[PDB]
């Protein structure tokens, strides 16, 4: 029988407290029942609905999510990392090879408008935006690896995100 899979809507496995998140399954249901079974750190939820909704993410909602339907096996777990802070670098992919595109996003607590946003590599300003916008390198290069973070203004407060590492492979 096929293995179900959990999917993240939207697709950021790193979120900030009070962020909304939606998990949905990819497994067909039986004619008798269309119920879903959701787990969360092997704890078992309660609702049988096809999508699991986290309105206001707390730190207790981090961990391993998995699901299963009538005509599927237990899904492989997907990790959700709920961080605390003002800013959080988010990416669609975190693994990079030579000539891959690098898409980076500076997500803010409750989608608050962000201004004078700077993306820094290795402690130096690399790209600046008057208004919160995404950072995008067309085709990676071995020199684009390093520690990255983003800072800007949350209405007079000057705030920073935690740094992430970014290595470029192959070549």
């Amino acid at each position: 029988l096929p293995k179900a899979v959990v999917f993240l809507e939207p697709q950021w496995y790193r979120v900030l407290e009070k962020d909304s998140v939606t998990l949905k399954c990819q497994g067909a249901y039986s004619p008798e029942d269309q119920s879903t079974q959701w787990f969360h750190n092997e704890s078992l939820i309660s609702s049988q609905a096809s999508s699991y909704f986290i309105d206001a993410a707390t730190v207790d909602d981090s961990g391993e999510y998995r699901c299963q339907t009538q005509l599927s096996t237990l899904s492989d777990p997907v990790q959700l990392e709920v961080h605390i802070g003002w800013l959080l670098l988010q990416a669609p992919r975190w693994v990079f090879k030579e000539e891959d595109p690098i898409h980076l996003r500076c997500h803010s607590w409750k989608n608050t408008a962000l201004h004078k946003v700077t993306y820094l590599q290795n402690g130096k300003g690399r790209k600046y935006f008057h208004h919160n916008s995404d950072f995008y390198i067309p085709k990676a290069t071995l020199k684009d690896s390093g520690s990255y973070f983003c800072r800007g203004l949350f209405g007079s407060k000057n705030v920073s995100s935690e740094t992430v590492q970014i290595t470029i492979t192959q070549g």
């Binding site: 949350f154 209405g155 007079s156 407060k157 705030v159």
Partner: peptide, 9 residues
């Protein structure tokens, strides 16, 4: 007073 960043201490 939009107070986007909350209080100061």
């Amino acid at each position: 007073p939009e107070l986007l960043g909350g209080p100061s201490v």
